[PDB]
Design an enzyme around this catalytic site. Sequence first.
Site, mmCIF file in Angstrom:
data_model
loop_
_atom_site.group_PDB
_atom_site.id
_atom_site.type_symbol
_atom_site.label_atom_id
_atom_site.label_comp_id
_atom_site.label_asym_id
_atom_site.label_seq_id
_atom_site.Cartn_x
_atom_site.Cartn_y
_atom_site.Cartn_z
ATOM 1 N N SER A 147 0.855 -1.198 0.000
ATOM 2 C CA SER A 147 0.000 0.000 0.000
ATOM 3 C C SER A 147 0.877 1.229 0.000
ATOM 4 C CB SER A 147 -1.095 -0.067 1.070
ATOM 5 O OG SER A 147 -2.049 0.962 0.863
ATOM 6 N N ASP A 255 -8.129 -2.529 -6.963
ATOM 7 C CA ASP A 255 -7.637 -2.333 -5.609
ATOM 8 C C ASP A 255 -8.640 -1.535 -4.779
ATOM 9 O OD1 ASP A 255 -4.978 -2.424 -3.838
ATOM 10 O OD2 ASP A 255 -5.891 -0.433 -3.638
ATOM 11 N N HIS A 301 -7.162 -5.792 -1.122
ATOM 12 C CA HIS A 301 -6.213 -4.755 -0.705
ATOM 13 C C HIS A 301 -5.019 -5.376 0.008
ATOM 14 C CE1 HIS A 301 -4.888 -1.320 2.023
ATOM 15 N NE2 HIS A 301 -4.601 -0.935 0.791
HETATM 16 C C1 LIG Z 1 -4.145 3.777 0.702
HETATM 17 C C2 LIG Z 1 -2.925 4.502 0.155
HETATM 18 O O1 LIG Z 1 -1.873 4.475 0.716
HETATM 19 N N1 LIG Z 1 -3.051 5.275 -1.040
HETATM 20 C C3 LIG Z 1 -4.242 5.409 -1.869
HETATM 21 C C4 LIG Z 1 -3.883 6.393 -2.941
HETATM 22 C C5 LIG Z 1 -2.374 6.555 -2.813
HETATM 23 C C6 LIG Z 1 -1.483 7.208 -3.635
HETATM 24 CL CL1 LIG Z 1 -2.197 7.988 -5.049
HETATM 25 C C7 LIG Z 1 -0.125 7.249 -3.359
HETATM 26 C C8 LIG Z 1 0.340 6.587 -2.215
HETATM 27 C C9 LIG Z 1 -0.544 5.926 -1.374
HETATM 28 C C10 LIG Z 1 -1.938 5.963 -1.717
#
Ligand SMILES: CC(=O)N1CCc2c(Cl)cccc21
Length: 357
Positions: A147, A255, A301
Amino acid sequence: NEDLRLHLLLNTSVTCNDGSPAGYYLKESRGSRRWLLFLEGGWYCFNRENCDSRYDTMRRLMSSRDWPRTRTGTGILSSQPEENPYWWNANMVFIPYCSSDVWSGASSKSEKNEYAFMGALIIQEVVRELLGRGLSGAKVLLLAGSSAGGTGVLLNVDRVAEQLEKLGYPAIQVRGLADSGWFLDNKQYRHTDCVDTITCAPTEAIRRGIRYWNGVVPERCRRQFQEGEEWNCFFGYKVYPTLRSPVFVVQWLFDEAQLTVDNVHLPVQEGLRLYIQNLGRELRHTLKDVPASFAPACLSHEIIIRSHWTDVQVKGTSLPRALHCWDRSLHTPLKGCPVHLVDSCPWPHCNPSCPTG
Ligand SMILES: CC(=O)N1CCc2c(Cl)cccc21
Ligand SMILES: *[C@@H]1O[C@H](CO)[C@@H](O)[C@H](O)[C@H]1NC(C)=O
């Protein structure tokens, strides 16, 4: 088993959001020259108000004060071959996410900063302190993460490689494994105001975050997008082509965090069906030229530190197998050992091996 032991950073100026020392959990495997450094995820915060709320009810993601002395390695961090057919004998490192900056920050808590955003420096400091604990003898350092930690891999893998080269360790092969951190800066299904964290559209929170965090991105990507546009480098399909280290990309086609930032909440009617199908097709398109990838058509996820990460297969090949094939490829394609595994079916769970929930 609680097999990874906490070490708070000896350089206590490299800190979590609240100024407490950052750290890492380590389980050594003497005789193994493989090191797995895993970056935890957990969203981010991009201003004082949302960081204050996260500090009240998500404090472990902002502070080490309450961290336990040990953690159990699970999934790719497990030392049991049954749970981890890929790298069960490696030296295992879990780096807690306590900087709320997608591992991009290099800003200390000061007179004018309520919080420190030091994710990029935490990674560098963990690597430095590990060199005295056996990492100096490594042949492969796999920087992995899930993530926000998966995006952290994309942002930091080349910096780790450059750090080791400058410190005098050119024989350590630095590689990246980015799980669930390959996002699209796409249009939301229904528009929301960027007032909170989970519903804010992807390309907006990162812009504010970079300023708030003093966030840094890989040099080649920065030179392409230039000042004020470094947010582009948080998006895998834009930053990946600029990276030199080998990077394996794991990404569900649907996701759940992508859908959350897109304001999708799951009888699906035509407009939402088209939106979801287009999202999967776009994700698939961005992976077409990523030779080492595992992208199953599931609504889910993260994957890599889940105990049952062994269960999903694409085209009959599991992720641990695909990662093993990747290792072999880094010793032309290998007979029966594929590394590019992207589902083509167009709807969540059209792959029968998707996690059941
Ligand atoms: C859950 C998360 O960590 N997200 C969702 C969107 C995102 C982006 Cl666009 C860059 C880095 C992390 C995250
Ligand atoms: C501690 O870490 C900070 C942040 O990178 C750095 O500025 C400083 O030089 C480090 N000091 C030592 C002794 O490692």
